[PDB]
C-alpha cells in the first residue's frame, strides 16, 4: 500500500508510456535522411576577437537586431559589446562577483543577469541619465541562478538551483508562476519561437517543457545519462536539442515525445556545455570542455566542422537571430565570432 | 554625418577601456578565497575572525583578501563549485573532533575526506591549492584524552600509525592527542599528495577557534601559494 503501491503504479505508467513510445517509433531519423544530401565539410574563420574580460566568460545573448551581444564574466561586470567594429557599448558593474547567466531583451531596453547571489538583477539601458543602473532585483530563489530568458519587458523566466523554475513580472517583483516537478539543479531553459512553451533541463538527465500560462509541465523527456547543461529549440519550435556531461547531444521531437537521435563520437571524452541551432536548423552547434567546439549535421549525425579558436572550456555559445554569425565565449575571457 | 555616431563610439570605447584597465589593476591586486565546510564544522567561527552567499573583505598588510562563504545553498556541490577555479586558495574547514554520540553523518571526518577527495580530483579545481583548517582541536583533545568512544573501529589504521618524526608537539599535551592530530592531518595529506602532479598543494593547520592568527596563517599560505606557482612556472620548483 501507500508508498510502495504508488511506486509500482508509477512503474506501470513508466513501462506503459515506454511501450507507447516504442509503438509510435516506426522508424528513426537516420533511415529517413540517409538519402539526403550531406552538408559536407564546412569551415568558418574568426571575424572578431572580443577582448577586455579578465575572468571566465559564462554566458551571452544576442539581440533582435543581431548587432549588440551581451557578455558576462566572473570579474564583477557585464559587458554589452558591438558585433561590428568590436566597440564596447556598455559595461555595467555587478554587486556579486560571479554570475552564471545573462539575458538580452528582444526590445533591447532591459538586460538581465544573475548568479550565486540568488538574485536576478535587471538593468535598464535607455535611462534619462544616459548611464546604466539597477532597475529590478528579483529575490526569492534559495539556489543559484543558471539561465534567464526574456519574453518581453514585463515577464522573465529564470532557471535556478532550487530544482524549480520561476516566471516573474518586472514591476511586481514577485514570482507570478513557479514551475516544479524537477529534482536536480535546473541549468538551461530555452524559449520556443512562438514564446508559449519553454524547455528546461535539470541535473537528473530529464528535460521537460512548461507552459508560461498555467504553469504545468506537459511532456517530460528522459533517456539521457547525466546532467543536461544546455538546450536550444529548433527554429520551427517543435523540437529541441540537449547536451550534457556525457559527450552526447540528443534531439528530442516535441510531437513525437521521444528520443529521436543522438550525436556522439568515440574520441569525445568531455561533455557539452553549450547547444544552439542555426536559422535553418540544419546545423547544430556543440561546445565541449576539451578546449574545442564543433558543428553537427542536425539530420545526419555527421560532424561537419571543428572550431579550435579557444584555449579553455567553451562555456557559452550563441547564434544571431538572422543567422549571420556564431559567437563562442570560453573560460579564456575571450569572445570569438565566426561565419 | 554618419561618421559622428562611430566617433562617439570610439570615445566611449576609450572610456570603458580606461575604466577596465583601472579595474584590471584593482582586481589583480585582489586575492579571492572561498571558505567551505559544514554548518557545525566551524564556518561561522572562522568567519568571526574577519543572499545565498556572503562576502568578507579584509586587509592583511595592505593586501585585499576577499573571503566568500556559501550560506543558503543546496548540498549538491558538483556544478556551482566550478565557478571557483580562479581563486588563489580554497579554505577547507573540517570538524576534527566530531567523529562520533551521534551527530549529523556521525562520520564527519569520513564525509570531509570524501569531499576533499572529490575537490582534489576535479578536472577544473586542479589549479587551486586548498588551504585546510583542522577546527575544534581543544574538543578533540578533551574527547581523546579520556573518552568512552575511541577513534578505533572508525579508522582501522590507528594501530599501524604513530607520531611522525617530523611532528611539532609544541603545546605539551598527551601523546595520544598528537597522534590523533597528525593522524587526521596525514589522512588529508594522503589524498592531497596522491594527485595534482605539483599543480596544487594542501596547507594543513590547527585552528583552535580561539585565536586571531588564522588571518595571518591564510596570508602566509597565499604568499606561499603564489611563490610556489611562480617557481613552478619559472621551471624551478
Amino acid at each position, epitope marked *: 500500500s501507500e508508498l510502495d503501491q504508488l511506486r509500482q503504479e508509477a512503474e506501470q505508467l513508466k513501462n506503459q508510456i515506454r511501450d507507447a513510445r516504442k509503438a509510435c517509433a516506426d522508424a528513426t531519423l537516420s533511415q529517413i535522411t540517409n538519402n539526403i544530401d550531406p552538408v559536407g565539410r564546412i569551415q568558418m574563420r574568426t571575424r572578431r576577437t572580443l577582448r577586455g574580460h579578465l575572468a571566465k566568460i559564462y554566458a551571452m545573448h544576442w539581440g533582435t537586431d543581431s548587432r549588440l551581444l551581451v557578455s558576462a564574466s566572473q570579474d564583477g561586470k557585464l559587458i554589452i559589446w558591438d558585433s561590428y567594429t568590436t566597440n564596447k557599448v556598455h559595461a555595467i558593474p555587478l554587486r556579486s562577483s560571479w554570475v552564471m547567466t545573462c539575458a538580452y531583451a528582444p526590445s533591447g531596453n532591459y538586460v538581465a543577469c544573475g548568479g550565486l547571489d540568488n538574485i536576478c538583477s535587471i538593468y535598464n539601458l535607455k535611462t534619462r541619465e544616459g548611464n546604466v543602473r539597477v532597475s529590478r532585483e528579483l529575490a526569492g530563489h534559495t539556489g543559484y541562478l543558471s539561465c534567464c530568458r526574456f519574453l518581453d519587458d514585463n515577464q522573465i523566466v529564470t532557471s535556478s538551483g532550487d530544482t524549480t523554475c520561476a516566471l516573474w513580472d518586472i514591476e511586481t517583483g514577485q514570482q507570478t508562476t513557479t514551475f516544479t516537478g524537477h529534482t536536480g539543479d535546473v541549468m538551461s531553459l530555452s524559449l520556443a519561437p512562438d514564446t508559449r512553451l519553454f524547455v528546461s533541463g535539470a541535473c537528473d538527465a530529464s528535460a521537460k517543457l512548461w507552459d508560461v500560462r498555467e504553469g504545468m509541465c506537459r511532456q517530460t523527456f528522459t*533517456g539521457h545519462e547525466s546532467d543536461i547543461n544546455a538546450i536550444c529549440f529548433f527554429p520551427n519550435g517543435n523540437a529541441f536539442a540537449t547536451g550534457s556531461d556525457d559527450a552526447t547531444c540528443r534531439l528530442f521531437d516535441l510531437r513525437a515525445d521521444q528520443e529521436l537521435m543522438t550525436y556522439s563520437h568515440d574520441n569525445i571524452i568531455c561533455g557539452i556545455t553549450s547547444v544552439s541551432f542555426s536559422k535553418s536548423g540544419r546545423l547544430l552547434l556543440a561546445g565541449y570542455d576539451d578546449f574545442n567546439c564543433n558543428v553537427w549535421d542536425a539530420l545526419k549525425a555527421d560532424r561537419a566542422g571543428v572550431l579550435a579558436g579557444h584555449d579553455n572550456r567553451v562555456s557559452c555559445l550563441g547564434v544571431t537571430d538572422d543567422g549571420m554569425a556564431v559567437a563562442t565565449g570560453s573560460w579564456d575571457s575571450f569572445l570569438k565570432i565566426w561565419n | 554625418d554618419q561618421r559622428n555616431e562611430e566617433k562617439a563610439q570610439r570615445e566611449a570605447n576609450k572610456k570603458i577601456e580606461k575604466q577596465l584597465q583601472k579595474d584590471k589593476q584593482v582586481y589583480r591586486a585582489t586575492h579571492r578565497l572561498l571558505l567551505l565546510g559544514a554548518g557545525e564544522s566551524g564556518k561561522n567561527t572562522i568567519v568571526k575572525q574577519m543572499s545565498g552567499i556572503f562576502e568578507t573583505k579584509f586587509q592583511v598588510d595592505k593586501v585585499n583578501f576577499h573571503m566568500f562563504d556559501v550560506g543558503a545553498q543546496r548540498d549538491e*556541490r558538483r556544478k556551482w563549485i566550478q565557478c571557483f577555479n580562479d581563486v588563489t586558495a580554497i579554505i577547507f574547514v573540517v570538524a576534527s573532533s566530531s567523529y562520533n554520540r551521534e551527530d*549529523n553523518q556521525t562520520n564527519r571526518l569520513q564525509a570531509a575526506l570524501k569531499l576533499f577527495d*572529490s575537490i*582534489w580530483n576535479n578536472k577544473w579545481l586542479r589549479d587551486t591549492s586548498v588551504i585546510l583548517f583542522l577546527n575544534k582541536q581543544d574538543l578533540l583533545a578533551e574527547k581523546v584524552l579520556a573518552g568512552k568512544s575511541k577513534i578505533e573501529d572508525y579508522f582501522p589504521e590507528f594501530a599501524r600509525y604513530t607520531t611522525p618524526e617530523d611532528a611539532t608537539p609544541e603545546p605539551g599535551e598527551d601523546p595520544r592527542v598528537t597522534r590523533a592530530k597528525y593522524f587526521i592531518r596525514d589522512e588529508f595529506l594522503r589524498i592531497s599528495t596522491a594527485s595534482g602532479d605539483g599543480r596544487h598543494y594542501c596547507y594543513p593547520h590547527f585552528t583552535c577557534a580561539v585565536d586571531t592568527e588564522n588571518i595571518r596563517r591564510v596570508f602566509n599560505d597565499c604568499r606561499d601559494i603564489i611563490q610556489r606557482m611562480h617557481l613552478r612556472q619559472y621551471e624551478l620548483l
Partner: nanobody
Amino acid sequence: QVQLQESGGGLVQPGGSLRLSCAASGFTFSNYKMNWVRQAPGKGLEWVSDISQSGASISYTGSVKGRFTISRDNAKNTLYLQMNSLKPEDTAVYYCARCPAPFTRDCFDVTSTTYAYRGQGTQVTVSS
C-alpha cells in the same frame, strides 16, 4: 533514463553474512564509478564504499573496512555488496549511488540528500 534497483537484504541475525545486488539500467555500466551509501534511521547519510570503472580502485569506510566487499560486473551491469559479521549498529537503509559524470575520478553528491541518480535501496535491520 537511469534506473537503479536494489535487491537482497532483510532481517538477519548479527554476525551473519548478507548480499545486496544493484541492477543498473538505462546507461553504460562500464564507464561510471559506483558508490554504496547507507542512511541510519533518524540519522543522516553515510558513504559506505566506492569502486572505480574497472574495479581496480576500491575504497571503504573505515568502520566497515575488512568486513565489506564490493564487486562490480559490467557484462550484466550489476554491483554486488557482501557483508560479513554484521553488528546491531549497522541497521540502516542502503542505496546504490552513482558517479555524476563519465570518465571522472571525483564523485561529489553521493552522500547529498535528494540525489538524482540514487536507487530506492533496501532496508537491512540487525537485532535479536
